[PDB]
Amino acid sequence: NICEITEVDSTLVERLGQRLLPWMDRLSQEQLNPSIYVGLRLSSLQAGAKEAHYLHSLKLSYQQSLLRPASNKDDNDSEAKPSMGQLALYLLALRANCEFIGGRKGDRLVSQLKRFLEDEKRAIGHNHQGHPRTSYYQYSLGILALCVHQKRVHDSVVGKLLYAVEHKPHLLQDHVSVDTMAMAGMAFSCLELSNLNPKQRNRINLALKRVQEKILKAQTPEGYFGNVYSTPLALQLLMGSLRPSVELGTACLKAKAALQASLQHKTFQNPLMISQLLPVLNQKSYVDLISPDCQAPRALLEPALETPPQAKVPKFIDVLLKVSGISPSYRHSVSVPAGSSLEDILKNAQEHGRFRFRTQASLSGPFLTSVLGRKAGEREFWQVLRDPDTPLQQGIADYRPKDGETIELRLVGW
Numbered sequence: 001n002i003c004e005i006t007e008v009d010s011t012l013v014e015r016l017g018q019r020l021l022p023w024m025d026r027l028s029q030e031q032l033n034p035s036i037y038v039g040l041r042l043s044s045l046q047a048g049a050k051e052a053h054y055l056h057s058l059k060l061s062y063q064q065s066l067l068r069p070a071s072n073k074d075d076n077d078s079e080a081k082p083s084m085g086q087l088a089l090y091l092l093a094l095r096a097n098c099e100f101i102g103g104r105k106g107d108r109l110v111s112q113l114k115r116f117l118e119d120e121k122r123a124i125g126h127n128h129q130g131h132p133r134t135s136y137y138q139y140s141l142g143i144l145a146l147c148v149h150q151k152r153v154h155d156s157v158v159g160k161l162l163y164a165v166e167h168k169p170h171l172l173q174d175h176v177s178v179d180t181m182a183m184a185g186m187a188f189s190c191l192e193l194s195n196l197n198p199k200q201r202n203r204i205n206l207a208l209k210r211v212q213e214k215i216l217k218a219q220t221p222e223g224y225f226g227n228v229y230s231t232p233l234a235l236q237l238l239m240g241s242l243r244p245s246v247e248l249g250t251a252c253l254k255a256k257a258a259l260q261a262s263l264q265h266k267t268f269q270n271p272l273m274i275s276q277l278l279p280v281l282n283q284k285s286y287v288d289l290i291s292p293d294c295q296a297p298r299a300l301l302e303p304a305l306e307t308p309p310q311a312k313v314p315k316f317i318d319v320l321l322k323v324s325g326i327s328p329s330y331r332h333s334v335s336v337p338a339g340s341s342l343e344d345i346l347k348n349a350q351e352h353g354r355f356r357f358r359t360q361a362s363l364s365g366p367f368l369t370s371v372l373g374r375k376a377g378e379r380e381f382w383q384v385l386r387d388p389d390t391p392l393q394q395g396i397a398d399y400r401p402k403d404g405e406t407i408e409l410r411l412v413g414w
């Protein structure tokens with residue numbers, strides 16, 4: 001297949017896998033990450049039966065958190081659980097261990113997921129005025145997750161994703177675009193291969209060509225689908241073929257070369273991103289979770305065990321932090337070692353100034369949710385940009401600012 005990464009330097013792959021390896025000892029509820037587990041299982045790499053403990057921890061935690069008693073002893077909250085889209089990735093994790101979800105606990109989880117989709121269906125509405133509470137990405141992920149376990153979703157649920165893909169000057173924001181198409185594509189593709197909604201078979205097939213079209217349309221001069229980070233999910237979808245073309249073949253070749261290029265430059269630092277890339281580098285996608293092969297051997301990753309101690313004096317960078325989209329705006333001047341994350345800088349400004357911010361856990365890491373006491377609301381988010389007006393492609397923990405950058409935290413409405 002032409003959309004498949006066919007040749008990768010195994011030492012690059014191994015370095016990527018070494019980035020996931022420490023996460024395998026991070027078993028706390030907020031660190032546990034079903035995406036990382038999936039990515040490893042579908043990769044050419046193994047992070048030990050560190051993996052087994054990890055799935056077991058996922059099982060215990062997702063079950064204990066999501067199946068809690070009918071009425072909790074005086075709180076309405078205690079120990080905020082995984083989200084439904086995370087439950088969807090947890091379902092992918094089980095398939096990655098060649099398990100189907102089951103038993104009474106598994107029935108309840110599946111219902112929770114179906115309720116989620118039904119609730120999103122309702123939120124989206126009638127004829128689609130109205131938004132998902134979460135996103136179409138999680139919507140698609142949910143359908144895909146149920147599909148790979150051979151669980152059917154209501155035709156009206158699937159309809160909502162199909163129509164969104166099908167209808168008009170495409171709804172989706174640029175940020176979500178390719179990634180959401182890729183994920184929806186993978187939901188549709190699973191539906192097809194599974195024949196789970198035969199009453200919309202043709203519609204699904206046409207949604208697939210659509211999804212393919214929009215992804216190729218989104219190709220950048222650099223070769224990326226959307227951006228470097230959407231490219232792996234794009235390729236995950238695209239390697240699933242069934243519409244082989246000359247445009248598609250050329251697009252994939254460009255996409256692949258751009259991706260391999262970025263691998264030489266330590267582009268992929270984010271554990272979730274790596275978890276999305278490794279499968280692709282092993283010619284696998286989430287859609288392979290339909291029939292996962294748990295017998296295939298993988299190369300054991302061993303701990304890097306070396307963190308190079310320079311005893312040098314590091315370069316410092318001087319960075320300007322600025323907050324906009326709220327009143328008052330705020331600025332902060334910080335000088336920190338080169339290689340400091342945006343997050344380090346935030347924590348520094350908080351420590352040594354009038355700054356404050358809050359993040360919350362996500363599978364991509366710390367997600368900035370509140371700056372200076374202003375918490376992003378319903379369709380708001382704290383956008384992170386490098387001045388002038390360039391949205392970062394990494395979040396706070398991964399973005400490592402350059403000398404002289406102005407980094408903007410902008411409250412925006414999408």
Ligand code: B12
Binds near residue numbers: 273398
């Ligand atoms: C939906 C989405 C959003 C939504 C999320 C809110 C919503 N309505 O649900 C919005 C528009 C707010 C958003 C924002 C951003 N996003 Co975003 N987002 C996505 C998308 C399409 C799906 C994520 C998802 O739902 N995952 C599934 C569920 C189960 O996972 P989850 O971990 O529980 O999801 C949470 C986080 O993803 C959080 N979130 C969203 N984006 C990001 C990015 C980072 C770095 C973090 C830590 C968290 C985070 O939102 C979800 C909670 O609803 C992904 C695509 C992808 N390839 O994963 C990109 C993606 C994760 N986002 C990305 C980026 C870069 C950003 C921003 C940094 C953009 C910016 N310059 O401001 C910001 C986050 C800044 C911040 N405040 O911390 C990149 C990250 C790449 C990388 N190297 O890590 C991705 C992969 C898109 C891309 N191809 O570039 N995003």
Ligand SMILES: [Cl-]
Binds near residue numbers: 109111112
């Ligand atoms: Cl339940």
Ligand SMILES: [Cl-]
Binds near residue numbers: 267270273394398
């Ligand atoms: Cl990254």
Ligand SMILES: [Cl-]
Binds near residue numbers: 358370372373
């Ligand atoms: Cl805050």
